[PDB]
Structure 1
């Protein structure tokens, strides 16, 4: 019953059982401010059984500082009643309700209880009941730049997954009778001592294939010991071991008990004396609120700060805390008591939603128990912050002005940002900018570009889109939605539909790039990141990179002339398998999936392209004869797809599918075994089909089998689609047609003038002339994983399973086939919320124009274990050029459009360096080892003319600069690296 068309990306993170158990839990949320509504949004997107809201407080203007579901026409109405209607539309499977009053007994109806904006006495009263009744209780709070989280899942919480990693699996070479297990050659098991594993598909020891867990003794990186296996056998050949994980029992403590003896989590190890301060400070805030009719201390007030510090002293004395309070930090907390930022709200909402999912699914390791977070380093220092400037001004930005002031509000309102991409991170970033009021002044502007279109699978974590929006451009929907959220951004947003790359330089030129204030990346491929990084380096603009992978996430900030660029932090590349392995000797399901992908492409894509090009290009045959690697293959494909094997109905498609089955699963295996018999030996006398090589076996077509029938159906459907015929699904027709099929005899063959040219000519003269068929085109089958009715994933799954059956490999279901073939990247909404929060917290650092490198932070986190870390950016490497300090990244030479000889003379004279190589992109303009005549011919030309002549392409009118890479040697002959040249046209 799980909607795999909507939760496709989330299932690869949670799983079927996790979501099935999650869809049976009720969640109550007390408090409906920015943090509460964010938590509700994340939970609704998650897919819980239901959500209940409770917030009777009437709306106020300042409450709109972070609540993006409120409008100025909703002032005076309870937040829950005006929020339920908008929340119910996010997901159709998650009902949203509102409760007028909350009695204690009513709490028995829910599975999780989230509490925000509630006094300490009420929280204690609720927790004293929700603890002994085994109901999860999570309490969150967000005061200015500070945040607190508390989790309590009872005293007998059972946690199934403790790290979020899949169980460690490996392929076994052989196992002795002493329990020694060794992987294949150069394969690391990676297990540790005390672990439990299970064995499957072990030859010689079938008993061990049952799966009973056994102890693990790590004897080395490639071998381990399991104990005694004397009874079950003497030696085991091959097989697969799989890690077995045991549940862990975690016992939480109630709030009342954990007040006296808290258990902290340190979000950063350089400053571990703060959480003891915040534990007192938040309680002091609650006490002061209770002491002033629920009115928090006024912003930047000294009298209220003194009273708050007195409350802190009294509480610290009362609770017997032997910690010396830090007056500065506590009074800072006092100043920002009434603050309300959207970045902190998003961050804490993501975290708490993740905690709710942990509570519901009994998965991942939860916080134990207190989590106090602060980003006080983000407070601006180049503007005036005082009580006069921080007073509320009766606008929707009061919750931010009360922390930063009106001057920083003006600074924000005049930004000209550029967001690349409109994925999940892009949408969240735009929401945050809309709430903060970024670029709402006269000189502000925002530009967002993205060329993809909305798909159904994108609706699980991109909340600015709706099912009615499927098929439309992302940028338009995002711009309209954020204009609706904040009407002041009407006309302040420009949306492009262009892919950012070398080909888009005509639109995103120098004029566009000289007005920006910062660039934010929301991409998913390294190429675009590198291109944008180079462009930013050229234009010297701050950049904000952010990436996610399942539950892990990282954010990086690049500041001009201060930090290194993102390219210097390039990630390791992908993995590819040897062609020999894929073609003939697979040993894993991934190999079969790649082989199936190649089979799909070679069956339904390339012959179709050849046929279409033959019917389109007037001189296709002659060009292909002397161009294609296998012109005979092309000619035979054309002949087969035009005359020899042109289907006339669906029965012929079924016949062709049967023929292809026999040709790919019965004859090729026979030929390969003929070349290398099962008893063959290497040149060293070793057996051939041993170790990483498995002896295949031909398959005989059994119609009653499920996999064979699936393959036949898929192949017939794809062939009919290629020829535009009508497919059918009833098994009766297939059984009837395939009953009367006589397989042509096949035996392996050993092989042993201009006949070949005459053979090609015979093939050619058999082809119908192109003029005889005008307007007749065949539709190639373009691979599309996201569609479930195109028989693509079905074909790949069937072919992979059949080839696995050939080589006795374990088949995989459609889920794993879709995961591997499509290279789907798991993604979550909570990770998106957290990364957006971190990026927006660094953005305020960028706005203030902080200079020190200790003021910036690159962030990394893993929510499967509750890990957060922040590290300073790496300083840009320096170098010595002509006895001067030069930044390796943020330096360049600016020269006019002079002739090559003048440029060389300038470098010889001004820099005292001899030029030995000069290139412009991928073209070699000049080199010191070139013949003298060519150089003498090239010297008197200007750089632009030289580039146009060499590249055989005129420079565009919009070009205003040239980036030249120069390698030059010093006077002594030592190569010295120099920054690039910026020729000014």
Structure 2
């Protein structure tokens, strides 16, 4: 604040900083930023205080449960620094109100997010604003810090990482190998009975499966939603028809069909102890019934969203998953465990975050001292690596000349049949999926620049069904996907190819 020393303290005081997220890392970060000197800080978060956040996020107290993180955050902080000039936004960072001009305001940006999706959006914004971005993360005892600067280092997407964990409908509906396969199976089943029927998230055995070259809200409502009726169709009839496909069942252990009748013939935490098949079969019936009773209160026509903190919902998935596992000779797991998996809960503790945040400010001080080339990705280990290092520091790498984002003139070639691929498969399986674009604005880079897809609703709605050829798109065509909010453009070279493969809509040139 007063000793750190002159030229540095100058920017630390006047400079304006932005912190994205006020959870574990966030709170610790604020405490430091402020104590270190930074007085002009802008906070942003889209969540409310939870009683579980009370073991690390010390800016919050029991009395603040339910309130806005960002809000309370500012309050708490202003206590041990009344002179602090803070501004908190209780809202998502994905919000279009926070455009490049907003980001270009700050001299430094720090992320404290808990998902790739946000990290991606923030990564691009800072590139567009060309403002230093300090990216971090933690998990249990592990965690890391790194710096990102357009043109200088690699961006958070020079080596693309998944925003979510995708699973093949094959091993999910036909051959579950990991316990997670059953829990996911359970979730679809949940979204197929009480939620939005997702065609992709089916549940019944698939006939058009590669492994076994063969020769469910329907069943639900047709049977009046009877647990027993269902049980026998999900853990007996379906499994039986599953065995019918002796192709997919060659060397791999075959499932064991169940029967509601037979089944009914048998200190850690309450939710840590596992129960017996029957006990779950009954929970399976008890949950379903209780679920529909709740869904009967939610207006008329309202669907249900699965939530790890919803008891009845947790009971269903827990039970459904275990029953599914038993059938596949996989050992059943407790509720506490299935909760973490179905809810992707990330084990968090204060110390681990407290470390990362300290490191963040340290890299920031360097960056503001014009010592960016001294910054580096730091890793926090649990046990000292062979060199006695608990905190592993490694240099920052240069931009990837083939990154689909930070590159100078992002461009790529997409091979696919311009006669079979619909305008939707483009805006969904390619532009949004592969290239990772949430708000696409594709157009044909031709003499007229035809608009094929628009981000704004009620415009390019009547095209999702049409064929790409219908728009004159052909071999050699050049498409331009844009995301103005992020000032991101991606030239897409179309390379027509009919005889490409099976079930392979398209394919980017550079993958295997």
Establish whether TM, by shorter chain, passes 0.5.
Answer: yes
**Cross-structure match for 1:665:** 235
Correspondence for 1:550 among 140, 148, 155:
140
Distance across 2 between alignment mates of 1:784 and 1:420: 24
State the Cα distance separating 1:496 from its structure 2 match.
Answer: 0.9
Query: 2-side partners of 1:960 and 1:594: how far apart?
Result: 34
- Given that 1:923 and 1:951 are in contact with CA atoms closer than 8 Å, whether structure 2 keeps it comes out as no
CA drift of 1:874 comes to 1.4
Match of 1:495 among 88, 98, 108: 88
Q: How has the CA–CA distance of structure 1 residues 513 and 796 changed in structure 2, closer, same or farther, with 3 Å as cutoff?
A: closer
1:818 maps to 2:367 = no
Is this contact kept in 1: 2:401–2:407, CA < 8 A?
Answer: no
The equivalent position to 1:870 in structure 2, one of 382, 393, 405, is 393
Secondary structure in structure 2 of the residue aligned to 1:545: strand
* Match of residue 473, structure 1, among 49, 68, 71: 68
Residue 542 to residue 716, structure 1, CA distance change in 2 (3 Å): same
Is contact 2:179-2:325 (8 Å) kept? Answer: yes
Assess if the C-alpha contact under 8 Å between 1:587 and 1:693 holds in 2. no
Aligned to 1:786, which of 303, 309, 330?
309
Aligned residues: 405
Query: CA offset at residue 514 of structure 1?
Result: 3.1
Greater C-alpha Rg: 1
The alpha carbon displacement at 1:466 in A equals 0.8
* 3-state SS, counterpart of residue 799 of structure 1: helix
1:36-115 to structure 2, matched below 5 A, reads none
Seen in structure 2, the aligned counterparts of structure 1 residues 473 and 575 have a Cα distance that, compared at 3 Å, is closer
Q: Which residue of 2 aligns with 1:447?
A: 42
CA–CA distance in structure 2, aligned partners of residues 478 and 827 of structure 1: 19
Structure-1 residue corresponding to 2:58: 463
- Seen in structure 2, the aligned counterparts of structure 1 residues 712 and 961 have a Cα distance that, compared at 3 Å, is closer
2-side partners of 1:575 and 1:435: how far apart? 38
Listed one character per residue, the Cα deviations across residues 268-293 of structure 1 (whole Å, up to 9, x for unaligned) are: xxxxxxxxxxxxxxxxxxxxxxxxxx
Separation in structure 2 between the aligned mates of residue 585 and residue 532 of structure 1, nearest angstrom: 38
Return closer, same or farther for 1:869/1:510 CA change in 2, 3 Å cut-off: closer
Q: Rate the CA distance shift 1:534–1:607 in 2: closer, same or farther, 3 A.
A: closer
Using the alignment, how far apart are the partners of 2:236 and 2:401 within structure 1? 64
- Residue 431 to residue 689, structure 1, CA distance change in 2 (3 Å): same
SS at match of 1:524: coil
Counterpart selection for 1:486 from 61, 67, 81? 81
> Structure 2: how far apart are the matches of 1:482 and 1:516?
20
- Could you tell me how far 1:635 is from its partner in structure 2? 8.1
Which residue of 558, 578, 581 corresponds with 2:171?
Answer: 581
Instruction: State the SS of the aligned residue for 2:158.
Output: helix
CA distance in 1, matches of 2:282, 2:379: 48
1:436 offset after TM fit, Å? 1.6
User: What is the CA-CA distance between 1:786 and the residue it aligns to?
Assistant: 2.5
1:707 aligns with 2:280: yes
Q: Which of these residues, 422, 425, 432, is aligned with residue 32 of structure 2?
A: 432
Aligned residue runs from structure 1 range 881-896, under 5 A: 889=406
Query: Quick check: 410-419 or 868-877, which moved more?
Result: 868-877
Q: How far is the alpha carbon of 1:510 from its aligned partner?
A: 4.3
Select which of 326, 336, 358 maps to 1:837.
Answer: 358
Summarize the Cα distance change of 1:452–1:406 in structure 2 as closer, same or farther, 3 Å threshold.
Answer: same
Aligned mates of 2:170, 2:152 — CA distance in 1: 48
Q: 2:443 aligns with which of 915, 924, 931?
A: 924
Paired residues of 2:108 and 2:131 also in contact (CA < 8 A)? yes
List per-residue Cα deviations over 1:698-757 (Å, max 9, x = no partner). 224307642233222222211222234xxxxxxxxxxxxxxxxxxxxxxxxxxxxxxxxx
Partner of 1:514: 104
The residue that corresponds to 2:181 in the other structure is 591
Displacement, 1:537? 1.4
Q: In structure 1, how many angstroms separate the alpha carbons of the residues matched to 2:123 and 2:69?
A: 23
Task: Give 3-state SS (helix, strand or coil) of 1:863's partner.
Answer: coil
1:846–1:951 distance in 2 versus 1, CA, 3 Å: farther
Find the aligned partners of 2:401 and 2:280 in 1 and give their Cα distance. 62
Counterparts in 2 of 1:841 and 1:589: CA distance versus 1, 3 Å: same
Equivalent residues of 1:597, 1:796 under 8 A apart: yes
1:427 positional shift: 1.0
Q: Quick one: distance in 2 between partners of 1:583 and 1:840?
A: 48
Instruction: Quote the residue 1:196 is aligned against.
Output: none
Structure 1 residues 890-909: aligned runs within 5 Å: none
Indicate if the aligned counterparts of 1:925 and 1:947 stay in contact, CA closer than 8 A: no
- In 2, Cα distance between equivalents of 1:422 and 1:872: 28
SS of aligned partner of 1:812: coil
Asked whether the 8 Å contact 1:422–1:522 carries over to 2, the reply is yes
> Residues 867 and 709 from structure 1, CA distance in 2 versus in 1: closer, same or farther, beyond 3 angstroms?
same
Closer/same/farther in 2, CA of residues 544 and 708 from structure 1, 3 Å limit: same
**1:305-330 Cα shifts (integer Å, max 9, x gaps):** xxxxxxxxxxxxxxxxxxxxxxxxxx
Once the two structures are TM-superposed, the CA of residue 952 in structure 1 deviates from its matched residue by 6.1
Once the two structures are TM-superposed, the CA of residue 515 in structure 1 deviates from its matched residue by 2.3
CA deviations over 1:302-353 (Å, ceiling 9, x no partner): xxxxxxxxxxxxxxxxxxxxxxxxxxxxxxxxxxxxxxxxxxxxxxxxxxxx
CA distance in 1, matches of 2:70, 2:443: 40
CA contact (8 A) 1:450 1:474 kept: yes
Aligned to 2:327: 806
Of 181, 194, 209, 1:604 maps to: 194
For structure 2, list consecutive stretches of 5 or more residues without a partner in the other structure: 199-215, 267-277, 411-438, 462-483, 494-512
How far off is 1:589 after superposition?
A: 2.0
**Residue 360 of structure 1 corresponds to which residue in structure 2?**
none
Evaluate the alpha carbon distance shift between residue 412 and residue 603 of structure 1 in structure 2; reply closer, same or farther with a 3 A threshold.
same
Name the SS of the counterpart of 1:454 in structure 2.
coil
SS of the equivalent of 1:603 reads coil
Q: 2:5 aligns with which of 384, 405, 409?
A: 405
* Partners of 1:584 and 1:952 in 2: CA distance: 37
In angstroms, what is the RMSD of aligned CA positions?
A: 3.7
Deviation at 1:584, TM superposition (A): 3.0
Q: C-alpha separation between the residues in 2 aligned to 1:462 and 1:776?
A: 36
Q: Taking structure 2 as the reference length, what is the TM-score of the superposition? A: 0.70
Q: Does the 8 Å CA contact 1:416/1:518 hold for their aligned counterparts?
A: yes
Kept in 2, the 8 Å contact 1:465–1:477? The answer is yes
Residue 527 of structure 1 is aligned with which of 117, 124, 128?
A: 117
Matches within 5 A, 1:267-666: 397-398=1-2, 401=3, 404-439=4-39, 445-489=40-84, 492-501=85-94, 504-505=95-96, 507-571=97-161, 576-606=166-196, 640=221, 645=224, 656-666=226-236
Shift of residue 420, structure 1, vs aligned partner: 1.2
Where in structure 1 are there 5+ consecutive unaligned residues?
Answer: 1-396, 440-444, 609-632, 646-652, 683-687, 725-774, 880-887, 894-919, 928-934, 954-958, 969-985
> What residue number does 2:475 align with?
none
Structure 2 residue 300 is matched with structure 1 residue 777? yes
Q: Report the CA distance shift for 1:692/1:828 in structure 2 as closer, same or farther (over 3 A).
A: farther
Q: Provide the C-alpha distance between the structure 1 equivalents of 2:485 and 2:197, rounded to a whole number of angstroms.
A: 45
Q: Distance in 2 between matches of 1:864 and 1:455?
A: 31
User: 1:848 maps to which residue?
Assistant: 369
- Conserved in 2, the CA contact under 8 Å of 1:721 and 1:779? no
Give the C-alpha shift of residue 573 in structure 1: 7.0
How far off its partner does 1:838 sit? Answer: 0.8
Q: 1:794 to 1:847 in 2, by over 3 A?
A: same
Distance in 1 separating the partners of 2:185 and 2:191: 10
